[PDB]
């Protein structure tokens, strides 16, 4: 209802899950639709010296399904009509666009690591676990995470950044190995083992750190409003209410965003299970 | 010493009696003092060979039509 | 630009029937015609024997 000065105030908190949505995950950048890869494998000769040996092996990859921003409904609507008659209320539906912009990177992190809601085939722990068993179940110990490193290194694989959230890291930090005193957690910049490794925090993922190898994003941008419809069709305080869907003055915000990521079908991953 | 990859891993996890850290890599792998060359290799898997003293020849550059 | 649809059949990706989502399907055109009445005309009309 409002009636008399509008005022509205954001936290800092979703340009920062941004920006490490994309640095961890390292997104190639890409100029066609979808997803493209390309393998190729050559095959040793032999010694002595008979016959030469050919045939080379080819590896194809691609990923299907775009990811689609979600468009603004009754609770930016409301906000508009205070837009158009209050000056305050007119800069905060321009905040409101680029909050939303952070926000979709935010989703596609949740999305994109975490099997929560996906919308590819492959989503980084789905796809990994689903292919062949390489996550340890149990309690977060820097011995077994020593061991654990050392497994995935040897079957040609290399981890870059480690996922994990501020709860996990925090019970990290005070797990501390027989012969190795150094963890980093509390410092500026932190590693799992050896290579530097981001925060991602997940909603979907409650306990331990997760290795992430190689992903793809293309077509990725920003969102634009000039005419959106409503199908819910919200009750408003001004006048009488309307049982009809979308209404001829502008009120939602519309958003276009694309992105599509590839799966290396090869990722560490760490989770707690009771004895 | 040569390192086979799977072998490097397990000795950087075990430490030293002393207060210092065993095979521990900041920059560059190192077992002693000079740098360990990592090799992949079918038939070993486990244990570190070291040898100084080693001829190697070569007649030139393979390529040919 | 398209407005949504609901008298037109839709069977790819997903039926329309009461609402739809604003996107540009089809291009509408606008045009005129109109033709005089003629006084003579030949035109055979099929019948049956």
């Known amino acids: 209802k409002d009636g008399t000065l509008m005022n509205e105030f954001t936290t800092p908190i979703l340009q920062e899950v941004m920006e490490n949505s994309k640095i961890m995950q390292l997104g190639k950048y890409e100029p066609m639709e979808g997803t493209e890869k390309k393998f190729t494998f050559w095959a040793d000769k032999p010694g002595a010296y008979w016959v030469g040996e050919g045939q080379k092996i080819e590896t194809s990859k691609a990923t299907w399904v775009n990811a689609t921003m979600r468009a603004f409904k009754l609770g930016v609507i409301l906000p508009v009509t205070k837009e158009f008659l209050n000056y305050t209320y007119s800069q905060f539906f321009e905040e409101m666009k680029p909050m939303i912009a952070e926000a979709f990177y935010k989703k596609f992190d949740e999305a994109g690591i975490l099997n929560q809601g996906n919308n590819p085939f492959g989503k980084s722990i789905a796809q990994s676990i689903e292919k062949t068993n390489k996550v340890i179940k149990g309690d977060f110990t820097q011995d077994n995470i020593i061991d654990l490193e050392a497994l995935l290194e040897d079957d ?120």
């Open 156 to 275: 040609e694989l290399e981890a870059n950044a480690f996922i994990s959230k501020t709860q996990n890291r925090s019970l990290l930090r005070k797990i501390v190995d027989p012969e190795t005193k150094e963890r980093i957690y509390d410092r500026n910049s932190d590693s799992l083992d050896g290579l530097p490794v981001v925060n991602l925090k997940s909603s979907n993922l409650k306990r331990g750190e997760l290795i992430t190898g190689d992903f793809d994003k293309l077509i990725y941008g920003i969102p634009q409003l000039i005419e959106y419809k409503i199908d819910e069709t919200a009750q408003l305080s001004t006048v009488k209410n309307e049982d009809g869907t979308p209404v001829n003055l502008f009120e939602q915000d519309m958003v276009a965003l694309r992105a599509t990521m590839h799966v290396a079908l090869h990722i560490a991953d760490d989770k707690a299970f009771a004895k």
